Design an enzyme around this catalytic site. Structure first.
Site, short mmCIF file in Angstrom:
data_model
loop_
_atom_site.label_atom_id
_atom_site.label_comp_id
_atom_site.label_asym_id
_atom_site.label_seq_id
_atom_site.Cartn_x
_atom_site.Cartn_y
_atom_site.Cartn_z
N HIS B 41 -27.47 -36.49 -4.10
CA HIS B 41 -28.53 -37.57 -4.32
C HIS B 41 -29.40 -37.51 -5.57
CE1 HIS B 41 -32.16 -34.88 -3.21
NE2 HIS B 41 -31.65 -34.69 -1.94
N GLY B 143 -39.17 -31.25 -5.42
CA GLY B 143 -38.56 -30.50 -6.40
C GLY B 143 -37.66 -29.34 -5.92
N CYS B 145 -35.11 -29.40 -3.97
CA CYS B 145 -33.61 -29.69 -3.36
C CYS B 145 -32.75 -29.03 -4.43
CB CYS B 145 -33.40 -31.24 -3.49
SG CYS B 145 -34.29 -32.01 -2.39
O1 LIG Z 1 -37.18 -34.86 1.78
C1 LIG Z 1 -36.92 -35.23 0.48
C2 LIG Z 1 -36.94 -34.50 -0.55
N1 LIG Z 1 -37.45 -33.16 -0.10
N2 LIG Z 1 -37.01 -32.10 0.27
N3 LIG Z 1 -38.01 -31.26 0.56
C3 LIG Z 1 -39.00 -31.73 0.45
C4 LIG Z 1 -40.24 -31.01 0.82
C5 LIG Z 1 -41.21 -31.88 0.29
C6 LIG Z 1 -41.29 -33.20 -0.01
C7 LIG Z 1 -39.95 -33.68 -0.29
C8 LIG Z 1 -38.79 -32.85 -0.17
N4 LIG Z 1 -36.41 -36.64 0.41
C9 LIG Z 1 -36.52 -37.68 1.66
C10 LIG Z 1 -35.05 -38.09 1.88
C11 LIG Z 1 -34.82 -39.12 2.16
C12 LIG Z 1 -33.55 -39.65 2.52
C13 LIG Z 1 -32.53 -38.96 2.42
C14 LIG Z 1 -32.78 -37.34 1.93
CL1 LIG Z 1 -31.31 -36.29 1.81
C15 LIG Z 1 -33.88 -36.91 1.59
C16 LIG Z 1 -36.40 -37.32 -1.01
C17 LIG Z 1 -37.26 -38.08 -1.30
C18 LIG Z 1 -37.07 -38.65 -2.70
C19 LIG Z 1 -35.89 -38.42 -3.41
C20 LIG Z 1 -35.64 -38.77 -4.77
C21 LIG Z 1 -34.61 -39.18 -5.24
C22 LIG Z 1 -34.15 -39.79 -6.58
C23 LIG Z 1 -35.27 -39.68 -7.38
N5 LIG Z 1 -36.58 -39.40 -6.99
C24 LIG Z 1 -36.90 -38.75 -5.83
O2 LIG Z 1 -37.89 -38.28 -5.45
C25 LIG Z 1 -34.99 -37.49 -3.06
C26 LIG Z 1 -35.11 -36.92 -1.81
#
Ligand SMILES: O=C(Cn1nnc2ccccc21)N(Cc1cccc(Cl)c1)c1ccc(-c2ccc[nH]c2=O)cc1
Ligand SMILES: O=C(Cn1nnc2ccccc21)N(Cc1cccc(Cl)c1)c1ccc(-c2ccc[nH]c2=O)cc1
Lengths: 306, 306
Positions: B41, B143, B145
């Site tokens: 991602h 942040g 991930c």
């Molecule tokens: O849960 C996450 C990322 N997370 N991981 N632990 C976390 C703990 C607290 C907050 C967020 C967190 N999600 C949601 C998600 C949605 C759909 C599929 C997936 Cl796999 C993950 C996430 C949200 C935003 C983004 C993003 C991608 C590109 C540019 N900017 C961004 O923010 C990535 C993931």
């Protein structure tokens, strides 16, 4: 989201752990620059523990009475001295893995990470509080003496604890990195016991603020309290009295959640008087006191889940 | 003495954490030999998360679409490929801090250490269980991930988890280091939720054996049970059924304490039916299920406090 008893990453400290042997006696030491620090009971036989005169035991040693092993590397000892309840060994090599570091004496209620070591090899890491009674509820076996406690701030390791003893109730006692014991304990066989302990009030309030930041408000109420009326309740439940300094420390958490400190105190008084009635807070059925206000800000979001 | 949720020392993993940036998008990666592993991602904009076609998003990138930062060192990307839900970036430099390592897919109920990272910098370490519902109750912020989970055995790091997602209930989902999710989850925006979870029975029994090793017998009783009669009680209290394989795994603990597994099961049935009646076990008022039998043997004395 989530809230866990998190330790600091241990790498900077792992690179400083060695084994110190004086005859048959082995334990861990901490190698910084060209010095190795360890508990001075390394110079004792088991029988010497009953009533050791460390001055007398030490003057009978030479530099070569001490073996220091760093991995599979023998370090040669070129000097030695006692500093309170530690031995300082000067060695022929500066540790190339020495981090930026400080020695700090922590205060009761403050938290630190422990790196449990055996034979100079790190085995595990966990977060502790310094109890009001100057003990830690650690997890240690025989061979763990010389294990260290620490905090990390911006690549600087603040060493605050060196392990010396398990007391008869199974809790642990040790020194700062100047070899002064925490609490009234001595490195000889006596009838010494852990004093009565108290719950760390400030830390319980910080953890209630953590549960609000993370989005839980169930334990809040419409009441407020005075500091005096709170403390009459604290006395009954074996909680540390709350002070104005403690109220001031909680200001940032109060500001982030919009809950006045004395309104959080009113919630805690109600939890103490009524109990949790089958409910949990951050996954816990008891009031947790091993997170400081600083630990909550480090770990939790800067944005309240409103 | 003592019993704590202990993590493995994190140094060997700290030396492998980097930052991976694709445009505006940044997260953590794991640098082993000449490869960097990260969540795929990283190639998404926030809007791409709604319904990403990763094949289509990736073919639109070059090697130079990716920036890898290891401390203050830029690593040049010289190849890239997708492996299930991970990106594998080939880089121009082998990590000189690469430990002996393996990639393992852990099973539900097993434990591991998490190294929480932000911007390629490690911030904390804690021990988790893989829940029966294939989530972890972590502590992660935006942040995090690309943060990894691991075990250490004799200087070999077994990587088992890479962080991808927080689910709506605030628990966490991720992949093995081949990029296969734990559980039914997908790396796109859906109505996916954590399934119903169950208490890890085997782990609760292991922790009762830990409390006996450490010298506490208060919860034991004069009864025994069959596996079938135990499991009728387990069903009622949302415990995993106990199996013969689970009984066999508890043999070493049973042998060390002289308590037959089904006699420990009888104790647990009584704790579930009656509750703890104001008492604690290893400092806990609840039945802990995040220590495996292996974790109890690692941490506890080989000598029971009889
Ligand atoms: O849960 C996450 C990322 N997370 N991981 N632990 C976390 C703990 C607290 C907050 C967020 C967190 N999600 C949601 C998600 C949605 C759909 C599929 C997936 Cl796999 C993950 C996430 C949200 C935003 C983004 C993003 C991608 C590109 C540019 N900017 C961004 O923010 C990535 C993931
Ligand atoms: O609690 C310890 C050492 N400990 N630290 N955490 C522990 C956890 C579990 C078991 C023992 C542990 N004590 C007792 C003690 C008595 C008096 C003063 C002190 Cl300061 C410590 C200890 C026991 C034996 C020896 C010893 C010395 C010389 C050679 N061989 C030995 O065994 C050293 C310390």
């Amino acid at each position: 989201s989530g809230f866990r008893k998190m330790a600091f990453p241990s790498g900077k400290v792992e690179g400083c752990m060695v084994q110190v042997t004086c005859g048959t006696t082995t334990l861990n030491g901490l190698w910084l620059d060209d010095t190795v620090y360890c508990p001075r009971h390394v110079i004792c036989t088991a029988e010497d523990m009953l009533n050791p005169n460390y001055e007398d035991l030490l003057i009978r040693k030479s530099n070569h009475s001490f073996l220091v092993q760093a991995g599979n590397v023998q370090l040669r000892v070129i000097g030695h001295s006692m500093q309170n309840c530690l031995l300082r060994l000067k060695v022929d090599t500066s540790n190339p893995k020495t981090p930026k570091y400080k020695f700090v004496r922590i205060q009761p209620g403050q938290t630190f990470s422990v790196l449990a070591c055996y034979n100079g090899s790190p085995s595990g890491v966990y977060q502790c509080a310094m109890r009001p009674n100057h003990t830690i509820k650690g997890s240690f076996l025989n061979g763990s003496c010389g294990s260290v406690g620490f905090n990390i701030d911006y690549d600087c390791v603040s060493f605050c604890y060196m392990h010396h003893m398990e007391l008869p109730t199974g809790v642990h006692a040790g020194t700062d990195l100047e070899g002064k014991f925490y609490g009234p304990f001595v490195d000889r066989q006596t009838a010494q016991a852990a004093g009565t302990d108290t719950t760390i009030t400030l830390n319980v309030l910080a953890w209630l603020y953590a549960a609000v930041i993370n989005g839980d408000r169930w334990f809040l109420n419409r009441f407020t309290t005075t500091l005096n009326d709170f403390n009459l309740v604290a006395m009954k439940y074996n909680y540390e009295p709350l002070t104005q300094d403690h109220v001031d420390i909680l200001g940032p958490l109060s500001a982030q959640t919009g809950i006045a400190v004395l309104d959080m105190c009113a919630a805690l008084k109600e939890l103490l008087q009524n109990g949790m009635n089958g409910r949990t807070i951050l996954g816990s059925t008891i009031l947790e006191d091993e997170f400081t206000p600083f630990d909550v800000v480090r770990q939790c979001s800067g944005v309240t889940f409103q």
